[PDB]
Ligand binder design. Structure first.
Ligand SMILES: Cc1ccc2c(=O)c3cccc(CC(=O)O)c3oc2c1C
Ligand SMILES: Cc1ccc2c(=O)c3cccc(CC(=O)O)c3oc2c1C
Lengths: 182, 182
């Protein structure tokens, strides 16, 4: 399955690298800033899983209640196959009623970009329907992997959603917040 | 298929982001004052593809006739879902008769690590036999993509190999050199 490999490669090639040091980098960030006397970031890495596989260039631009705040301190890698890559994660501000309301490390799952690309290239032989099925399957497979992984306990949260074509103008921020509030 | 998703993901998530500025970076390295006239590096990316999916943390060690020379200058990333990542690529010298006989940018394909891991975790439901067939399928799929991809013409080389049953006398060095001298 396309989704199966993606769920595994996302875990092996990213999450494992990132997760172990994440709580620490966040502790660093909360104590070391100011900037600023007003904080403060949640402990998990919130992963966005749009089922439509729509990933924006800019997460901030896309939503008006999600505003880029800052970056976490950088991380360096020396697990196998990666040496001297430099990584960063981004912190976002969430507003509710022009207020408050959350500060968290937030990012789109990169393999959705791949699922989208595949759907648009004739060479992939991958239909838009295939994409939706694999996107759901990707989410389920990843949930399962993470549930059992030593690296991934209490420091990661999956936010899966579809924005309904029918009626409503969906709130990404309400979605993130609902997950956030625990 | 697992391979299909891995190959497409490797193209979308690494190659088409790294290849466009590769030749520019190589020449810049080739130009540099410090870079003694000895050893003009070749202009393509040499991607190692062990079919047994064995990937060492240290390539230079796998073959004594293959030694790490230097690092290319770092590349910073703009692209979406990745802001401010920093990539680096490594330069290696190859030897014939104990003396340098080639210089090239050389690395193992990361998704083979994932295929190896999947074979090692019960949850992946992935056998060793599965792994080999998926590794061959990965190489084939990647070839087809790069065969007609705009990002990837004349700047990339795939070296796929199996180390024989009769001997470990198999030399990667010669395999790489073989491709290297043409
Ligand atoms: C831009 C981009 C697009 C897709 C992937 C990806 O599918 C993918 C799948 C598994 C692991 C990685 C590596 C990572 O997310 O750092 C991946 O990275 C991607 C990147 C960086
Ligand atoms: C350490 C490691 C292991 C596996 C992958 C991977 O499967 C994988 C698959 C597709 C894309 C990427 C990203 C990349 O290789 O830069 C991938 O990165 C991985 C990395 C960095």
């Amino acid at each position: 399955s396309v989704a199966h490999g993606l769920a595994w490669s996302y875990y092996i090639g990213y999450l494992r690298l990132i997760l172990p040091e994440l709580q620490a980098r966040i502790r660093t960030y909360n104590q070391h800033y100011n900037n600023l006397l007003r904080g403060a970031v949640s402990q998990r890495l919130y992963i966005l899983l749009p089922l439509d596989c729509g990933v924006p260039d800019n997460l901030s631009m896309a939503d008006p209640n999600i505003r880029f705040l800052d970056k976490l301190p950088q991380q360096t890698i020396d697990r196998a196959g990666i040496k001297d890559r430099v990584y960063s994660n981004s912190i976002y501000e969430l507003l509710e009623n022009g207020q408050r309301a959350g500060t968290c490390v937030l990012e789109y799952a990169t393999p959705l970009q791949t699922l989208f690309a595949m759907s648009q290239y004739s060479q992939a032989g991958f239909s838009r329907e295939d994409r939706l099925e694999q996107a759901k399957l990707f989410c389920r497979t990843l949930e399962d992997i993470l549930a059992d992984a030593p690296e991934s306990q209490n420091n990661c949260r999956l936010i899966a959603y579809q924005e309904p074509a029918d009626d409503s103008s969906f709130s990404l921020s309400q979605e993130v917040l609902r997950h956030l509030r625990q």
